[PDB]
């Protein structure tokens, strides 16, 4: 439930005798955790809110100019000086002008001309700082079992902040899922500013919100603003000798939009900013999970397919059954079988133990299950009233292993070293791989990783040729980098 | 030269940058630097202000 | 744990104390308490030895 149709879900199975499993949660998909004798739980990261951000250095992308003025001097006098150069609200530019004996000053050298124009910025952008504290994640989890396909004992919501990283989700009758999580190290919110232009908010990397050539204030907006650049958005174009002219460049809001690329959008509610693209790593201490249904007597009245058979994107099969004759809280017999002569259970039933909880007249329940690759029958019911459905699965285990390796490669390309923590009950091989991946990742991000799609495809083709025809012992080295680089393109 | 009434402003290790309103006056010399701040001085964080 | 041992010396209703400590470089948890009420905090350090 709640991860059936996500199409980016992965199954985390097994544990150290029921102690705990490490799991990384992502905004895109969700994780269904299934244990030996514990109810399958679907866990998803929903929203990340950032709170009380602090304004830093707001820019101007639309200038407006005002009453120009100018002053000229004797070809041989000092330099022009307007009294409006002693005002930090004017842009002033000094140049040389052809002058003399026609304009009014007897001499013929170049003069000196100063032009000043008042500056006013309309609707300038603002970035704000994000501390890795006061940052909240909201995790939604649900349980399989009795919920039909459509205070409720089966779903929980957990708020996790650096000030309280550990929480227990109390699922009534199922016990409680303990959940220890790491909120700080999630997405490295120590280089990302929150940027607004006009009701559109982005996540922006520092070193891109400091190398912007636009008039910038700094922090406290108190009275008549003071813009530091003062020259970029105003163009002092000058005709030789005769004229000086001041124009403003226009509105800049489209040049920023294209400068933003690879920056994440966000949306803001009140003083808080919700990001919908994130990354979180929680350890799941599932040793207080119980099975509600056991000790029930299995239901023997009849079962009817209501929704018949549905296949998810990953191979599993969802079934929605309706139970006719009221027994009570009562167990559902269900299995995958081939050779209906001898009902030998095959495949795996990924739902804990389906149980109907209602006792009114007719009840609805949804289970799902992981059938074998060949043809098979979904068999539901006890005897002489067993409904069977015929189900066919596509691909042999080899294709499954290949798709698993592809998923692992994509998860690594997205997460870095953190990917080694997805199914990380934790050994020594896993830890060693994580360490060497940390080292190689630091090296790679320090050498490359100032490049974009096209740039790295170029340098990848280049080093492919190089490693191909170098003929020394470094060839492999070259070749290795190329996989990395190229893999980073063909996974976006 | 002769100098006159100084003033100053500080910020948290993670806020913007200090800004005196006397920076918009062309009669004041102003200089910006980094100062150690935190937890004694008045804001909880420890970097350079 | 840099502070030598952290002892609360004022007992009226609620007391305040400040300690500091030198954590390892990976992720870690500051654990303050004994059982079932040990508030904890998630803390991350940057650089290898």
């Amino acid at each position, epitope marked *: 439930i709640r991860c059936i149709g996500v199409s980016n879900r992965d199954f985390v199975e097994g544990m150290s005798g029921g102690t705990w499993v490490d799991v990384v949660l992502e905004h895109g998909g969700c994780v269904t955790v299934m244990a030996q004798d514990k109810p399958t739980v679907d866990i998803e990261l929903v929203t990340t809110t950032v709170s*009380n951000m602090a304004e830093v250095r707001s820019y101007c992308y639309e200038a407006s100019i005002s009453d120009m003025a100018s002053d000229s001097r004797c070809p041989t006098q000092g330099e022009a000086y307007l009294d409006k150069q002693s005002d930090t609200q004017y842009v002033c530019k000094r140049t040389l002008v052809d002058r003399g004996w026609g304009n009014g000053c007897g001499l013929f050298g170049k003069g000196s001309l100063v032009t000043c124009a008042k500056f006013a910025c309309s609707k300038k952008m603002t970035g704000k700082s994000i501390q890795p504290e*006061n940052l909240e994640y909201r995790i939604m989890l649900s349980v399989h079992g009795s919920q039909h396909s459509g205070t409720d004992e089966n779903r929980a919501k957990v708020e996790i902040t650096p000030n309280s990283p550990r929480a227990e989700a109390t699922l009534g009758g199922f016990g409680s899922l303990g959940l220890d999580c790491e909120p700080r190290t999630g997405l490295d919110f120590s280089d990302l500013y929150y940027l607004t232009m006009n009701n559109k908010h982005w996540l922006v990397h520092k070193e891109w919100f400091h190398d912007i050539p636009l008039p910038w204030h700094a922090g*406290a*907006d*108190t009275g008549t603003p003071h813009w530091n650049n003062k020259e970029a958005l105003v163009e002092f174009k000058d005709a030789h000798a005769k004229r000086q002219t001041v124009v403003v460049l226009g509105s800049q809001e489209g040049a920023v939009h294209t400068a933003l690329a690879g920056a994440l959008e966000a949306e803001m509610d009140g003083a808080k900013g919700r990001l919908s693209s994130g990354h979180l790593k929680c350890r799941l201490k599932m040793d207080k999970l119980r099975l509600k249904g056991v000790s029930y007597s299995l239901c023997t009245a009849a079962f009817t397919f209501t929704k018949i058979p549905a296949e998810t994107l990953h191979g599993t099969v969802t079934v929605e059954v309706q139970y006719a004759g009221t027994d009570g809280p009562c167990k559902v017999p269900a299995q995958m079988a081939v050779d209906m002569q001898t009902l030998t259970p095959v495949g795996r039933l990924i739902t804990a133990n389906p149980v109907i909880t209602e006792s009114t007249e007719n009840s609805k329940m949804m289970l799902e299950l992981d059938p074998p690759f060949g043809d098979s029958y979904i068999v539901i019911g006890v005897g002489e009233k067993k409904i069977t459905h015929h189900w066919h699965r596509s691909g042999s285990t080899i294709g499954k292993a290949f798709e698993a390796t592809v998923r692992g490669a994509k998860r690594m390309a997205v997460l870095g070293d953190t990917a080694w923590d997805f199914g990380s009950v934790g050994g020594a091989l896993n830890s060693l791989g994580k360490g060497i991946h940390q080292i190689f990742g630091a090296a790679f991000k320090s050498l490359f990783g100032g490049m974009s799609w096209f740039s790295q495809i170029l340098i990848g083709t280049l080093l492919m040729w190089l490693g191909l025809n170098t003929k020394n012992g470094s060839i492999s080295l070259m070749c290795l980098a190329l996989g990395g680089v190229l893999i980073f393109l063909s996974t976006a | 030269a002769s100098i006159s*009434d*100084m*003033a*100053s*402003d*500080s*910020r*948290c290790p993670t806020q913007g940058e200090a800004y005196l309103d006397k920076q918009s006056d062309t009669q004041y010399v102003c200089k910006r630097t980094l100062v150690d701040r935190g937890w*004694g*001085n*008045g*804001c*909880g964080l420890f970097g350079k202000g | 744990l840099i502070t030598a041992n952290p002892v609360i010396t004022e007992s*009226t*209703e*609620n007391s*305040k104390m400040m300690l500091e400590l030198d954590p390892p470089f990976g992720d870690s948890y500051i654990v303050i308490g004994v059982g079932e009420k040990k508030i904890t905090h998630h803390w991350h350090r940057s650089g290898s030895t």
Partner: antibody, heavy 121, light 109 residues
């Protein structure tokens, strides 16, 4: 440890006044000083401040430009030279002092009895 | 602009022996740097609490302070006759624009 304030009096709009605040019982140089006023029927308003050493001074926007705070550490005296007075400045002024090792920050303070300044036309 | 403090009720009518609770809400994050002052007519304002929970020297124990995010609370367990006065909160965050709240008056009910 006490602060004795003086100099308050009735004056016409546009008049100039000088308030004094003598400190006793502590090292005046190590204390950042502040002026906080309270108009009749209004809450306390923090208007001005000066560091312990006299280096820097702060004035609130409501008083910025007209009032000047200063101090003499040898005579242990804080001065608040207020010019261009307006009827809105009619209030009780208190000088407060706090041990500071940073420009204006302080934790435990000491207050004077206050002095009334009336600006009526 | 400047940080502003809001004291919720502006007036508290209680009888001697009751429990008084005053709240102060800040416009932006201030970690613990909030002070509580008691002001009686004809007397200089008296510092009660600094760092939002620490009682000043000589302050009786019946005054307590608590913080949650931007919401600060001053609690007076056992109201005394001399405890009926005006109470102000002041923000001490990082620089002088320091401000007080509009004040809340504890009146005899």
């Amino acid at each position: 440890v006490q602060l004795v304030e003086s100099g308050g009096g009735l004056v016409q709009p546009g008049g100039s006044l000088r308030l004094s605040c003598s400190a006793s019982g502590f090292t005046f140089s190590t204390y950042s000083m502040h002026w906080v006023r309270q108009a009749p029927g209004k809450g306390l308003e923090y208007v001005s401040a000066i560091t312990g050493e006299g280096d820097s001074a702060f004035y609130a926007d409501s008083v910025k430009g007209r009032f000047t705070i200063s101090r003499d550490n040898s005579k242990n005296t804080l001065y608040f030279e207020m010019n261009s007075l307006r009827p809105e400045d009619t209030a009780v002024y208190y000088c407060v002092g706090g041990y500071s090792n940073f420009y204006y920050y302080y934790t435990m303070d000491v207050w004077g009895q206050g002095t009334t300044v009336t600006v009526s036309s | 602009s400047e940080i502003v403090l809001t004291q919720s009720p502006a007036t508290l009518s209680l009888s001697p022996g009751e429990r008084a609770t005053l709240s102060c809400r800040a416009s932006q994050s201030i970690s613990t740097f909030l002070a509580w002052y008691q002001h009686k007519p004809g007397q200089a304002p008296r510092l009660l609490i600094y760092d939002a929970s620490t009682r000043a020297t000589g302050v009786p124990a019946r005054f307590s302070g608590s913080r949650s995010g931007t919401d600060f609370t001053l609690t007076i367990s056992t109201l005394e006759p001399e405890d009926f006065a005006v109470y102000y909160c002041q923000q001490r965050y990082n620089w002088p624009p320091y401000t007080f709240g509009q004040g809340t008056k504890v009146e005899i009910k």
